[PDB]
Design a protein around this ligand. Structure first.
Ligand code: CLA
Ligand code: CLA
Ligand code: CLA
Ligand code: CLA
Ligand code: CLA
Ligand code: CLA
Ligand code: CLA
Ligand code: CLA
Ligand code: CLA
Ligand SMILES: CC1=C(/C=C/C(C)=C/C=C/C(C)=C/C=C/C=C(C)/C=C/C=C(C)/C=C/C2=C(C)CCCC2(C)C)C(C)(C)CCC1
Ligand code: SF4
Lengths: 160, 203, 63, 41, 91, 192, 80
């Protein structure tokens, strides 16, 4: 796909694993083998070897630079590069957008609506932050019932 | 009536008429006027597809463990060959699902409209309530009619057996994803060492 | 004159900040010759910081 | 606590407590699950 | 090949379309669209002496109103199609 | 009555032949657009019902499908074999100039009718057998659009079978389907 | 120089005159408000154009309005 070799069989990706441990191994040569800063570089090497063995096992595509490239078209092999964490993101981002929208409706029908935005009512906030879990069923539910959008006759419009 | 949470106020929309009502709408997914008519029809197909799902996931796998059917596992049943192509059987299903669900779609939208036959109109369905198509094709024994207190109990028994099957089928799905073993063998591996075969050990 | 005191009106004046906005009538002047007698109070201020403005009855409808 | 919790519910304190929890969570995700470029699930 | 027959038949086909087929389609559209109009008046009516529609050049003796401009328009398409055909054949 | 129980819209009352109320997107909502759509639905269907015998009957008699009998014009020499016989006047500039003259004279004479009903069904010279001047008139117009929409769906089938399976024709798609019908369906096109 | 225009939305609150630093505006009698007075700009040739009157006008939108036009030595604010 797109002229990119897989990273498990890429010679450039294995070259970057070789020259990263060798950079960290030469950093280890000036420390005692049981010393505290040498345990951090030894944990860095095992973090590096975990990283390169994770990138090759996920079917990542590596170019001529030896670097893993993401295919965001919507490929059946490449769902976890953009499509799977994008749907994970939009669920979380729609959770932020739904509990901030539902908080403003809950404080617009209050005695002092502007004091509830500088001082956020946490019992009112936390009872709808739980309610933002099921938000695609509540956003399209408000879209189908007409409560999501406001009619243009009740919207402040600058003159022509 | 009993509720899902003692000391919690029941919502104003779930008033206790609906069979299976335990005041369980914490996230307010059926608040809106006219919305609880759609969410019962959604619950009824999902509960009946899950009881159809649980009878095809657990019962042929249990009888495979006894060994009187030798049926393959349900998560490997899509790889099994038949007299038809597996891709072909998808589209033949959704042409038949285009008929059966759109007749069901008009019943939710316009109740009392599609109880008559499209071909031979003397054959009419005897169901009166929305979501309960009584007739010779669906209720040949006539168990869907009687007193309203008697009818509420058997409608409560559909959804309580149905919500268990939904949880069941959702359980088999995640069990086959992280353990890759069929769910009757997951039960039999839990009656041997229960404290070592747990969701933390299977991650 | 005016719609009503203490009523909810919507402003039809194009150059106001509160165009298509809900406002509360606090005073209508019944003296003749006044061009903009209806005094409408708004919950939100404009850029000048005021919420009190005078409109004609032709620039308001009851909502 | 009729006014101490009101101060604790203000916009800068609740932004500090949420983003302290938010960056506290995302750092602790990045310890046990580091170098995460592809979501496997 | 056959330049003298391909060009003549293709010009004669488009002139047959211009006189007997598309002449009610063209005469209706030059009356519905009319003269070009700026600000409610014609360009000649607004003061442009060079925008006057010529009538001596448009004075036709054809009974259907088919003038020499329509000869120069439909016959131009018959040569455009006729040299489309000759270039496609000679390839 | 394209959906039992569905409310038919106000611009589709049922008095039209074939008025089954099928307009979910509301394309015929404009009244003057809807009068053009009724004379467009019938010319299309009548060309489609002149096309289904023009596809199957050349294929069933063995002179190829409607694609391989059409590729001769792109070839410099194809000789225009009709019923197994090459016509002498079958050149691409010859048969296109006749088609851009004869059909264009037919379509310009068709568009010249001011009546919005004689544009639909003209009669007279186009009805020499006198079935329009008979006892049944409404059900034959319902027969026109039910047969016409079937051939309109058929020509849509005809076209997308050639895109999905190039080099094969609709009776050859029928012969492929008649051998092993549970393996070779639209799912071969949907699922590659 | 500058053209200062008063519109009929004025309530006669007088603060456009009080904010004026070059004595352009004055309050004349009027019949279109509760205060029975409207502003006017007779000495509009003395207007610097600072729009302090527009900053002090509580009417939405503004009743006093200053349009910056041809600028002379009055409206440039020079002492040399
Ligand atoms: C309460 C939640 C809330 C909701 C649901 C939205 C939703 C909307 N905003 Mg946003 N916005 C908000 C908060 C919110 N905003 C706040 C707090 C700010 C100040 C930073 C803005 C500043 C703003 C700008 C500058 C723009 C939008 C626009 C948009 C639209 C597209 C989303 C976007 O551009 O990315 C979000 C944009 C941001 C700048 C991120 C702010 C979101 C914060 C982090 C959420 C805070 C909520 C929490 C309870 C406090 C959409 C109508 C765009 C528009 O005009 O509509 C098409 C646009 O141009 N918004
Ligand atoms: C898609 C599944 C589904 C649907 C259509 C509903 C629909 C209904 N349920 Mg529910 N129910 C289900 C699953 C479902 N149930 C299961 C599996 C359980 C057991 C855990 C229950 C337990 C239950 C109780 C005890 C009661 C309800 C009731 C309600 C009603 C109001 C709340 C609502 O609209 O929820 C709408 C829900 C959805 C649209 C599902 C959203 C799922 C989100 C997107 C993800 C959730 C992830 C999941 C946990 C894994 C409505 C008839 C009340 C009632 O009166 O019933 C008649 C009642 O008191 N439910
Ligand atoms: C919606 C519910 C559901 C679905 C998805 C299916 C679908 C499947 N089951 Mg299953 N099953 C179900 C409910 C379900 N089952 C129920 C209600 C029972 C009865 C308790 C069974 C009993 C059962 C058996 C006994 C076997 C299957 C098998 C099959 C497969 C082909 C079905 C067949 O032979 O055509 C039937 C066609 C008809 C027209 C009838 C397919 C994977 C077979 C399998 O795994 O392949 C070898 C198999 O032998 N199922
Ligand atoms: C636990 C099983 C269960 C239960 C309690 C019921 C209960 C009900 N169903 Mg339901 N339903 C179920 C399974 C269930 N259903 C499933 C799996 C499907 C999909 C095939 C259906 C499809 C369905 C429809 C569409 C209709 C009903 C109707 C009925 C009603 C009368 C029939 C009756 O008494 O069934 C008793 C059920 C059993 C004894 C379970 C048998 C289990 C075998 C042995 C396996 C009653 C409310 C009818 C109705 O209300 O019409 C008025 C109706 O026509 N149901
Ligand atoms: C009808 C409900 C029900 C029943 C009786 C079972 C029963 C079983 N499941 Mg479970 N499962 C359920 C629903 C169900 N599940 C649901 C809804 C999920 C999806 C989130 C799972 C996901 C799941 C995993 C991933 C695992 C099990 C496993 C198990 C066994 C040990 C319990 C455990 O550690 O996981 C309990 C996990 C839960 C999330 C509890 C949910 C149960 C409530 C009632 C719903 C046990 C035999 C384990 C196994 O393979 O056994 C050897 C195992 O690895 N299940
Ligand atoms: C919208 C822009 C954007 C996007 C898509 C990402 C997304 C990502 N970055 Mg990030 N990053 C960004 C902006 C962005 N970054 C910026 C602005 C900074 C500077 C503060 C960084 C610095 C940064 C750090 C230092 C780390 C991430 C990491 C990550 C991953 C997060 C994995 C997890 O569970 O947490 C993910 C691939 C982590 C990772 O796994 O790297 C791949 C990690 O090491 N990023
Ligand atoms: C070009 C062909 C053509 C045109 C002009 C129309 C025109 C119309 N049809 Mg239609 N129809 C046709 C083909 C055609 N149809 C075929 C192929 C089908 C079978 C699937 C039907 C099935 C159908 C029914 C059952 C009914 C109509 C009716 C209608 C009328 C109102 C709906 C409308 O405005 O549709 C406008 C449609 C178009 C402009 C066609 C183009 C659509 C887009 C641009 C492309 C679509 C691509 C497609 C999905 C593949 C109008 C006379 C109703 C009526 O009263 O009939 C008299 C009626 O109830 N039609
Ligand atoms: C819209 C209708 C229409 C169109 C344009 C076509 C077009 C075509 N058909 Mg066809 N056909 C039609 C309807 C039509 N057919 C119908 C309804 C029938 C049944 C009578 C036939 C039976 C027919 C046969 C049997 C043959 C054609 C053939 C032809 C081709 C040459 C025609 C020719 O030489 O002119 C002839 C002009 C006159 C006789 C005048 C041409 C591509 C030939 C073909 O496909 O190539 C092998 C072929 O052999 N057609
Ligand atoms: C009324 C006209 C009509 C009829 C009777 C046929 C008949 C045939 N077509 Mg066709 N086709 C149609 C319309 C029709 N089609 C339309 C409009 C489409 C576009 C969605 C297609 C798309 C199409 C393809 C590309 C294929 C067929 C195939 C087939 C076979 C049926 C198997 C299948 O997958 O059906 C599919 C039928 C539909 C999706 C719609 C059918 C609607 C009618 C009214 C029922 C059969 C020989 C297959 C074949 O034989 O090739 C191997 C094949 O793969 N057709
Ligand atoms: C029948 C008749 C008649 C006659 C007529 C005639 C004879 C006509 C002719 C006509 C003609 C004779 C015409 C022509 C025309 C032509 C033209 C008009 C041309 C043009 C051309 C063009 C323009 C072209 C172009 C081009 C070029 C140049 C180059 C490049 C390419 C192209 C091709 C594009 C009469 C009157 C007696 C009457 C009676 C009847
Ligand atoms: S400040 Fe504005 S409202 Fe007040 S008197 Fe001057 S012009 Fe009128």
């Amino acid at each position: 796909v797109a002229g990119l070799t897989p990273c498990k069989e890429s010679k450039g990706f294995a070259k970057r694993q070789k020259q990263e441990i060798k950079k960290l191994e030469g950093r280890l040569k000036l420390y005692a083998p049981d010393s505290a800063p040498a345990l951090a570089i030894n944990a860095t090497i095992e973090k590096t070897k975990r990283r390169f063995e994770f990138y090759g096992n996920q079917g990542l595509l590596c170019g001529t630079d030896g670097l893993p490239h993401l295919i965001v078209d919507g490929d059946q092999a490449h769902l976890g590069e953009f499509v799977y964490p994008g749907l994970v993101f939009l669920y979380i981002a729609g959770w932020i957008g739904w509990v901030g929208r539902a908080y403003l409706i809950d404080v617009r029908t209050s005695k002092k609506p502007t004091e509830k935005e500088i001082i956020i009512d946490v019992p009112l906030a936390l009872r709808i932050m739980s309610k933002g879990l099921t938000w695609p069923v509540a956003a399209i539910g408000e879209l189908r019932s007409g409560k999501l959008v406001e009619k243009s006759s009740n919207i402040t419009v600058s003159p022509r | 009536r009993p509720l899902w949470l003692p000391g919690s106020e029941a919502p104003k929309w779930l008033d206790g008429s609906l069979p299976g009502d335990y005041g369980f709408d914490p996230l307010d997914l059926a608040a809106e006027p006219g919305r609880l008519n759609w969410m019962v029809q959604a619950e009824l197909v999902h509960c009946r597809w899950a009881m159809l799902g649980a009878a095809g996931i657990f019962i042929p796998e249990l009888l495979t463990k006894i060994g009187i059917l030798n049926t393959p596992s349900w998560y490997k049943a899509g790889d099994a060959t038949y007299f038809a192509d597996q891709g072909t059987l998808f589209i033949v299903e959704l042409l038949l699902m285009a008929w059966a669900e759109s007749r069901r779609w008009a019943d939710i939208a316009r109740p009392g409209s599609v109880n008559t036959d499209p071909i031979f109109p003397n054959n009419k369905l005897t169901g009166t309530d929305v979501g309960y198509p009584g007739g010779l094709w669906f209720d040949p024994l006539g168990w869907g009619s009687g007193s309203e207190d008697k009818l509420k109990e058997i409608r409560t028994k559909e959804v309580k057996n149905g919500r268990l099957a939904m949880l069941a089928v959702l359980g088999a799905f995640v069990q086959a994803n992280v353990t890759h073993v069929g769910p009757i063998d997951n039960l039999f591996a839990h009656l041997a060492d229960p404290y070592h075969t747990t969701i933390l050990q299977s991650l | 004159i005016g719609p009503k005191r203490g009523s909810i009106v919507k402003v039809l004046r194009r150059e106001s900040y509160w165009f298509n906005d809900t406002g509360k009538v606090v005073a209508v002047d019944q003296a003749p010759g006044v061009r903009y007698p209806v005094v409408v109070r708004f919950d939100k201020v404009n850029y000048a910081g005021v919420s009190t403005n005078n409109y004609s009855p032709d620039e308001l409808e009851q909502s | 606590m009729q006014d101490v919790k009101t101060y604790l519910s203000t916009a800068p304190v609740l932004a500090t407590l949420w983003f302290g929890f938010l960056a506290g969570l995302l750092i602790e995700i990045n310890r046990f699950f580091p170098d995460a470029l592809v979501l496997p699930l | 090949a056959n330049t003298a027959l391909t060009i003549t038949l293709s010009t004669g086909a488009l002139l047959f379309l211009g006189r007997f087929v598309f002449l009610p389609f063209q005469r209706d559209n030059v009356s519905r669209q009319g003269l070009p109009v700026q600000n409610g008046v014609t360009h000649f009516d607004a003061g442009d002496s060079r925008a006057q529609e010529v009538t001596s050049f448009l004075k036709t003796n054809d009974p259907a109103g088919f003038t020499i401009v329509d000869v120069l328009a439909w016959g131009a398409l018959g040569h455009a199609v006729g040299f489309f055909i000759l270039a496609t054949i000679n390839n | 009555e394209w959906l039992p129980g569905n409310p038919r819209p106000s611009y589709l009352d049922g008095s039209a032949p074939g008025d089954f109320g099928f307009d979910p997107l509301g394309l015929g909502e404009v009244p003057e657009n809807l009068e053009r759509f009724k004379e467009s639905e019938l010319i299309h269907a009548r060309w489609a019902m002149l096309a289904v015998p023009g596809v199957l009957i050349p294929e069933a008699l063995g002179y190829g499908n409607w694609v391989s009998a059409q590729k001769w014009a792109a070839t410099p020499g194809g000789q225009a074999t009709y019923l197994g016989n090459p016509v002498p006047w079958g050149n691409l500039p010859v048969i296109l100039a006749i088609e851009f003259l004869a059909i264009a004279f037919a379509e310009s004479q068709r568009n010249g009718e001011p009546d919005p009903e004689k544009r639909k069904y003209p009669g007279g010279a186009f009805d020499p057998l006198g079935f329009s001047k008979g006892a049944n008139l409404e059900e034959l117009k319902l027969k026109e659009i039910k047969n016409g929409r079937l051939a309109l769906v058929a020509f849509l089938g005809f076209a997308v079978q050639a895109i999905a399976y190039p080099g094969t024709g609709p009776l050859e798609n029928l012969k492929t389907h008649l051998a092993d019908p549970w393996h070779n369906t639209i799912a071969h096109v949907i699922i590659p | 120089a500058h053209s200062v225009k008063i519109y009929d939305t004025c309530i006669g609150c007088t603060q456009c005159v009080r904010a004026c630093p070059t004595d352009v505006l004055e309050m004349v009698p009027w019949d279109g408000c509760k205060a029975s007075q409207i502003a006017s700009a007779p000495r509009t040739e003395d207007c610097v154009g600072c729009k302090r009157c527009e900053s002090a006008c509580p009417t939405d939108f503004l009743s006093v309005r200053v349009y910056l036009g041809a600028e002379t030595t009055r409206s440039m604010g020079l002492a040399y």
